Ligand code: MED
Ligand code: MED
């Protein structure tokens with residue numbers, strides 16, 4: 001499936017880019033991802049990480065869900081990304097333009113730590129811990145959250161998530177500007 | 179010493195800022211650190227992390243060493259920063275304008291992971307592992323390095339360091355554009 005993952009992302013990334021009439025170099029400037037890497041991704045040569053995907057989506061001002069718009073069904077089954085084995089994504093609600101929401105249930109394993117690049121301007125995130133203890137980084141600091149605890153923050157800044165207990169599960173609501 | 183740390187940083191940050199004729203708001207825009215936090219730091223109300231210090235120095239286009247220029251001696255003794263207990267900094271060579279180099283010996287403990295904001299444009303880093311196993315993040319990926327291994331990268335991008343073994347020690351050369 002790692003190879004099928006590559007082809008899915010490669011083809012849709014190209015569609016998203018071409019639909020916007022963007023060159024690879026212009027897309028590189030927008031996303032902060034090298035033109036070289038973007039070329040490799042579209043050719044199915046490199047498997048992008050979840051963090052790189054968000055970086056690209058942010059630059060294109062697209063939702064994470066947009067990477068699967070050609071085959072919406074895939075999103076509800078895409079739990080394990082090849083380059084992120086200690087993190088599993090369960091999409092509860094794919095991006096909806098009317099509410100601007102994208103909702104995921106994330107499972108962090110082996111005390112994995114996930115740092116992210118800023119998402120698009122104005123994108124806001126909500127976090128609700130379902131199990132374990134985890135920490136969320138933003139505004140230059142880590143915020144520890146136990147089961148049941150919650151918090152929201154402006155995600156258009158360097159941020160991150162980390163499981164303090166070996167395992168942690170949390171709901172993540174990503175709200176895009178309307 | 180945590181309090182002495184705060185006063186040292188508070189006073190020199192203000193000097194560096196004032197010497198440049200910058201307002202707090204202008205400094206906020208340059209560094210990406212909120213004006214609120216910058217105000218608290220200068221008043222000795224909040225203890226900045228090593229990551230925040232680099233973020234500020236980068237925006238002011240100053241060296242990390244500049245934060246101790248009022249009392250150079252302090253740098254050679256400042257090993258443990260209050261908000262970074264799993265990371266110890268041993269400055270071997272403070273910033274020198276003729277070579278543009280700043281050299282540190284860093285000890286990471288309890289498999290600590292250190293993510294950093296981009297340093298100033300053109301700043302380059304060299305890494306040489308003295309002990310243990312560690313990983314360095316840049317160009318969207320982690321690079322694992324064992325004892326004796328080395329690597330260099332452009333640090334004006336999101337990057338980071340992580341000890342894979344409980345403890346890891348490495349030399350870090352930070353070269354600023356001349
Ligand atoms: C649903 S993927 C994990 C969450 C996403 N907001 C990120 O920063 O990576
Ligand atoms: C000497 S402090 C650790 C190294 C510094 N280049 C950083 O990114 O944090």
Ligand SMILES: [Zn+2]
Pocket residue numbers: 116119125155159
């Ligand atoms: Zn995020």
Ligand SMILES: [Zn+2]
Pocket residue numbers: 294297303333337
């Ligand atoms: Zn650095």
